[PDB]
Amino acid sequence: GRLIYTAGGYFRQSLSYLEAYNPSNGSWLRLADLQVPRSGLAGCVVGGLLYAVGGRNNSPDGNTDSSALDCYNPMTNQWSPCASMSVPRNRIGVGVIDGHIYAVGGSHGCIHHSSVERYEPERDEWHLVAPMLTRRIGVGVAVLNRLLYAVGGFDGTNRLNSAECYYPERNEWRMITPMNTIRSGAGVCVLHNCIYAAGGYDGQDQLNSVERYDVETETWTFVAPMRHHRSALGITVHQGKIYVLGGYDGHTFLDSVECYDPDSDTWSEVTRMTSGRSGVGVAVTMEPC
Numbered sequence: 001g002r003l004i005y006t007a008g009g010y011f012r013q014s015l016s017y018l019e020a021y022n023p024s025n026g027s028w029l030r031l032a033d034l035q036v037p038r039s040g041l042a043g044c045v046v047g048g049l050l051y052a053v054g055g056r057n058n059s060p061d062g063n064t065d066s067s068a069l070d071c072y073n074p075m076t077n078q079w080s081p082c083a084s085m086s087v088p089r090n091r092i093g094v095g096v097i098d099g100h101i102y103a104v105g106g107s108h109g110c111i112h113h114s115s116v117e118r119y120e121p122e123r124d125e126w127h128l129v130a131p132m133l134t135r136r137i138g139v140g141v142a143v144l145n146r147l148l149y150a151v152g153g154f155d156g157t158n159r160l161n162s163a164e165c166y167y168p169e170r171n172e173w174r175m176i177t178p179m180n181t182i183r184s185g186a187g188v189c190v191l192h193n194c195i196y197a198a199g200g201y202d203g204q205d206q207l208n209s210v211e212r213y214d215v216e217t218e219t220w221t222f223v224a225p226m227r228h229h230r231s232a233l234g235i236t237v238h239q240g241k242i243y244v245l246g247g248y249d250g251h252t253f254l255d256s257v258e259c260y261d262p263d264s265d266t267w268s269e270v271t272r273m274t275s276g277r278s279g280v281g282v283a284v285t286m287e288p289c
């Protein structure tokens, strides 16, 4: 079976937790801690390995933005460092295309990045690619049909409803239709032919709303809202269903995990994380041993 891995996050300070949830039986497993606490990171999987990318260690002894890439092997339950990115990237978004990891946007202190870089596991090397048209931190990233989408975020001055697409063979970014909602620190993922954007912060309030972009019609449509308003949520897809994990609702660091069934257009509570946290990294891969 395949598990939903949550890495890092934030509650009082940045966290080192790695925990795995099994939708088939409801169980949570605590696995090997990250070597360095981090929130505002992203997770992804390549070749069955789990990668934790970017973030920041918010800690009583100082705050340090992360350029780190670290690899977790479920076969061994061990974290291994990989090559670091060109720059620290807190509140990062990532996407995988053709076995390569794209790191998108994020912050380094007051620097809000438009830059983008690509990691090649076989070479353990990062290389910069074309920058986005917009500086974006708290950016949602997804991949559909081997194209990379950057959705919403914060540009240093304003939260954004805008979104853009990267065409790898042209090394070029182009704007797409903006969302109907300003969203920073949303969860963004792909399901079927659609890019979903769930929650986020609009400048005044945390959001429960969810909308999706159909690449064939170039339009965004709202679907059913989540049960919990949330920003800095984790999101992933497991067996054709969207899962959202944790985040902040303006009041509480949520332990709520919700899942979306596109066929019934309904959200339901599925489990609680072992403790409330925001700004996790999430991805799906095989069971450990």
Ligand SMILES: CCC[C@@H]1CCCCN1C(=O)c1cccc(-c2cccc(-n3ncc(C(=O)O)c3C3CC3)c2)c1F
Pocket (backbone or CB within 6 Å): 009, 010, 039, 040, 058, 091, 092, 137, 138, 139, 153, 154, 159, 184, 185, 200, 201, 231, 232, 247, 248, 278, 279
């Ligand atoms: C010291 C951190 C406090 C912070 C902010 C105030 C509320 C308590 N805190 C969090 O819960 C938190 C902690 C770590 C990371 C994140 C995190 C993750 C991804 C994206 C963004 N992100 N990126 C742009 C924006 C924006 O506001 O436009 C955000 C916030 C709307 C989410 C933020 C956290 F939110």
Ligand SMILES: [Cl-]
Pocket (backbone or CB within 6 Å): 039, 040, 056, 058, 090
């Ligand atoms: Cl932060």
